[PDB]
Amino acid sequence: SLRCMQCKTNGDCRVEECALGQDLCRTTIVRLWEEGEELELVEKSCTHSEKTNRTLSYRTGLKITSLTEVVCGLDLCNQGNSGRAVTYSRSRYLECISCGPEEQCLPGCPGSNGFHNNDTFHFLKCCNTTKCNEGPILELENLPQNGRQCYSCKGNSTHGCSSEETFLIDCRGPMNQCLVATGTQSYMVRGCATASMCQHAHLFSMNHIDVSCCTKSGCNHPDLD
Amino acid sequence: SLRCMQCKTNGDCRVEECALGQDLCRTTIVRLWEEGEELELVEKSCTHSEKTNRTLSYRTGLKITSLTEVVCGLDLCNQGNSGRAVTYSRSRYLECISCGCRSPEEQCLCGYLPGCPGSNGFHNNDTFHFLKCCNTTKCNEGPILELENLPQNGRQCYSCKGNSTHGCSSEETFLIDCRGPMNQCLVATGTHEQSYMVRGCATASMCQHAHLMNHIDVSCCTKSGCNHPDLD
Numbered sequence: 325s326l327r328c329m330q331c332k333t334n335g336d337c338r339v340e341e342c343a344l345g346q347d348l349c350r351t352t353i354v355r356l357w358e359e360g361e362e363l364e365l366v367e368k369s370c371t372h373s374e375k376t377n378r379t380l381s382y383r384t385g386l387k388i389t390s391l392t393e394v395v396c397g398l399d400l401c402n403q404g405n406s407g408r409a410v411t412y413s414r415s416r417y418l419e420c421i422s423c424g425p426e427e428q429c430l431p432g433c434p435g436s437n438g439f440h441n442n443d444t445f446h447f448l449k450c451c452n453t454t455k456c457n458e459g460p461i462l463e464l465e466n467l468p469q470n471g472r473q474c475y476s477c478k479g480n481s482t483h484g485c486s487s488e489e490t491f492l493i494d495c496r497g498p499m500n501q502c503l504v505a506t507g508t509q510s511y512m513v514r515g516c517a518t519a520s521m522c523q524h525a526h527l528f529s530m531n532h533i534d535v536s537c538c539t540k541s542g543c544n545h546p547d548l549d
Numbered sequence: 550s551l552r553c554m555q556c557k558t559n560g561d562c563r564v565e566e567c568a569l570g571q572d573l574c575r576t577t578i579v580r581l582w583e584e585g586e587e588l589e590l591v592e593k594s595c596t597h598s599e600k601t602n603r604t605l606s607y608r609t610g611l612k613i614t615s616l617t618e619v620v621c622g623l624d625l626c627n628q629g630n631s632g633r634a635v636t637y638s639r640s641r642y643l644e645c646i647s648c649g650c651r652s653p654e655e656q657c658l659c660g661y662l663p664g665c666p667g668s669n670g671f672h673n674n675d676t677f678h679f680l681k682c683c684n685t686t687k688c689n690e691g692p693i694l695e696l697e698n699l700p701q702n703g704r705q706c707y708s709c710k711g712n713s714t715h716g717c718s719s720e721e722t723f724l725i726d727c728r729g730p731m732n733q734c735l736v737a738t739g740t741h742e743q744s745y746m747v748r749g750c751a752t753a754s755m756c757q758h759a760h761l762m763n764h765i766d767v768s769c770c771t772k773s774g775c776n777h778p779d780l781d
């Protein structure tokens with residue numbers, strides 16, 4: 325009876341006897357090139373000569389890339405303040421797509437969104453063209469001054485956003501608009517935004533998010549709401 | 550000097566004092582939805598507040614997918630049966646592309662001459678090649694279907710591979726029924742690294758501009774069985 329080598333990189337590799345009706349050994353090679361990169365994967369497994377039917381997935385056309393950065397000056401501040409351990413990666417698959425952050429099955433895309441203040445940065449770009457995908461998303465530390473200045477805070481009207489705590493900051497990159505965002509107990513941020521953000525906002529990450537923008541330096545000052 | 554968390558997936562995780570002038574701790578979260586799949590990555594590291602330059606890549610626009618599948622029915626035959634070990638995965642990067650004669654590797658500067666956009670299929674009795682070239686995000690989301698998922702399209706071609714004395718003689722040449730869009734009979738004769746020969750079912754694209762065998766010589770016809778040896 326028929327035994328094949330069962331092996332793929334980062335896997336439990338063994339010789340295995342196959343199930344009945346698995347009559348073929350297989351070597352698979354996937355070579356993939358994009359953006360000057362060449363990936364080459366090999367997988368060896370049993371397999372079958374029978375044709376077997378399989379569903380085809382919903383070709384969405386859209387790839388959504390979302391970035392969030394947080395910075396601080398104090399020691400060890402990027403340590404997580406949880407009791408338990410921190411997530412560093414996560415694969416999530418929506419199995420509806422194989423038949424049988426939005427949940428559509430059976431948005432203000434394409435475009436980019438941007439926001440930042442003195443110590444946090446959120447960028448989101450969704451693309452239906454290949455060039456859009458190949459572009460990298462630049463973090464705060466690589467965006468130059470744009471001549472705009474806006475006010476920055478986050479927190480209650482008494483903790484996080486209060487005359488002491490709100491500072492004027494020099495905007496960077498395409499975030500050449502000033503922004504306020506109101507939401508939820510009451511909670512608020514100020515910072516530089518892209519004009520894109522002011523139309524379709526998506527942030528922390530509160531609800532009943534109320535957003536307004538103005539396009540002159542300093543104009544998101546508190547005594548202007 | 551300031552000590553921050555340095556940690557990431559498949560990374561060396563620790564607390565480290567940062568280099569001078571790196572006055573900030575950082576936490577970065579990248580969520581990435583694509584083809585019904587949500588991937589998120591977190592990175593904690595040092596960084597700095599002064600803006601510092603970084604170049605962007607030449608965005609090529611193309612994604613070349615390539616599936617290759619080889620089968621046999623004999624015990625332990627997907628053994629690579631060489632003395633030395635075998636490559637399960639390999640990543641290559643062209644450093645030029647970060648702002649630092651090709652086919653199908655690439656030449657950035659013998660440049661931008663594929664004839665690609667589209668797909669190229671070929672199979673024979675026991676091997677299968679398919680080359681999906683992409684220009685839009687929708688052809689990417691199309692998976693490449695293994696031979697076990699292809700119906701028979703009605704065409705029949707002859708099939709061999711190897712020397713004209715060993716592997717591609719009337720003795721070793723068998724008719725096979727093609728599957729999928731591989732509705733053309735093909736012979737190709739190239740070279741290894743003497744003369745090489747291969748016959749199989751291929752696609753019309755495979756016959757126009759496609760490869761993947763040096764000094765490739767390809768000929769295609771579309772009547773079942775017409776890639777028979779004594780027809781060349």
Ligand SMILES: *[C@@H]1O[C@H](CO)[C@@H](O)[C@H](O)[C@H]1NC(C)=O
Pocket residue numbers: 377700
């Ligand atoms: C899918 O598979 C079923 C049974 O396995 C078969 O009746 C049907 O015709 C197949 N459809 C296609 C398009 O191959």
Ligand SMILES: *[C@@H]1O[C@H](CO)[C@@H](O)[C@H](O)[C@H]1NC(C)=O
Pocket residue numbers: 385433434452453685686
């Ligand atoms: C992307 O979507 C827009 C609609 O907003 C459409 O006009 C355009 O043709 C699409 N591009 C691609 C490459 O699908």
Ligand SMILES: *[C@@H]1O[C@H](CO)[C@@H](O)[C@H](O)[C@H]1NC(C)=O
Pocket residue numbers: 479480482483484
């Ligand atoms: C908002 O106010 C309450 C009480 O006034 C306080 O306990 C809480 O910490 C404040 N919010 C933040 C984010 O500090």
Ligand SMILES: *[C@@H]1O[C@H](CO)[C@@H](O)[C@H](O)[C@H]1NC(C)=O
Pocket residue numbers: 602
């Ligand atoms: C990169 O830095 C150089 C000098 O270091 C500067 O002249 C240039 O303007 C910077 N890049 C851009 C795109 O401005």
Ligand SMILES: *[C@@H]1O[C@H](CO)[C@@H](O)[C@H](O)[C@H]1NC(C)=O
Pocket residue numbers: 453454666684685686
């Ligand atoms: C793909 O490239 C071709 C040029 O060969 C062009 O006609 C087409 O619009 C491109 N599609 C996209 C989505 O860029």
Ligand SMILES: *[C@@H]1O[C@H](CO)[C@@H](O)[C@H](O)[C@H]1NC(C)=O
Pocket residue numbers: 711712713714715
């Ligand atoms: C045909 O090729 C084989 C290798 O597959 C080689 O060993 C053999 O000598 C060749 N036959 C000739 C040159 O007649």
